From a paper:
Cytosolic sulfotransferases (SULTs) comprise a family of enzymes that catalyze the transfer of a sulfonate group from 3′-phosphoadenosine 5′-phosphosulfate (PAPS) to an acceptor group of the substrate. In doing so, SULTs modulate the activities of a large array of small endogenous and foreign chemicals, including drugs, toxic compounds, steroid hormones, and neurotransmitters. As expected, all SULTs share the same basic fold: a central four-stranded parallel β-sheet surrounded by α-helices and three loops that are often disordered (dashed lines) in the absence of PAP and/or substrate. The crystal structures of SULT1C3 bound to PAP, apo SULT1C2, a ternary complex of SULT1C2 bound to PAP, and the environmental toxin, pentachlorophenol (PCP), and SULT4A1 were solved at 3.2, 2.0, 1.8, and 2.2 Å, respectively.
In some cases, partial stabilization can be attributed to molecular packing in the crystal, as in, for example, the stabilization of α14 (green) in apo SULT1C2. Helices α4, α5, and αı5, and loops α5-α6 and α15-α16 are ordered only in the ternary complex, but not in the apo SULT1C2 structure. The degree of disorder and the exact conformation of these loops vary considerably across the family, but in general, the presence of ligands (cofactor and/or substrate) is coupled with increased order, namely, the formation of helices α4-α5 (gold), and α14-α15 (green). Thus, SULT1B1 and 1C2 appear to be much more closely related in terms of structure and activity than their global sequences would indicate.
Numbering used by the authors: 8 to 73, 80 to 87, 92 to 228, 262 to 294
Amino acid sequence: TKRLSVNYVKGILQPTDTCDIWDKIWNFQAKPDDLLISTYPKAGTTWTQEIVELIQNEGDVEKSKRFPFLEMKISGLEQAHAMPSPRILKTHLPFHLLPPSLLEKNCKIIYVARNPKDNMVSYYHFQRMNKALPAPGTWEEYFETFLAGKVCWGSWHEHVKGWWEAKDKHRILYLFYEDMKKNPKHEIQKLAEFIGKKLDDKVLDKIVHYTVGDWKKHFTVAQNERFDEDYKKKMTDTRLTFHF
């Protein structure tokens, strides 16, 4: 499949059909009970959405009863527009580019961050499959492209940091993909509680049943030391912190 056009919009690479609708995305109309799931690409968006659906129903069979990406257009705006409330919305936007209605209405946002080395590997494969995304080049090229943030939705570093800095003054639950992998029950309960559910010592277990390090096989040691030196320079407010 031939690849589609990708261009800078407000400082980040995006699919050109996204770019073509920027003022529509920006002017997105949120509702107070909207729940937004925000992640860098391949940082757990689908997984988090499933857990959230399940949280909202608790019962696994009535869940086939509702997904739109604010920014996307093959559009996320249209599917959002015609969805009943409470809506579950998705985005890969960096925090400073979030449609302002989402903050004016004080909607609950769940951000999920993933360690950048596994995220780089996943995003590399994603770009290999997805026509709407730029050609990733070889792995060795891609490593440098990602390190520089020359990918859709911008630098991973800017992304996670911007969202982390936001959590103080905006209604954001900041989760780590690795924590969800290690201690799901603990994370599902945090998520439940953020969303307003006082759930059960045993409803958790149903969702826990029903719903890291791999990057080491892909990075050379040289790539790794270069990555870490770069990271140390970009990431200087070390309350923010990842398991690798």
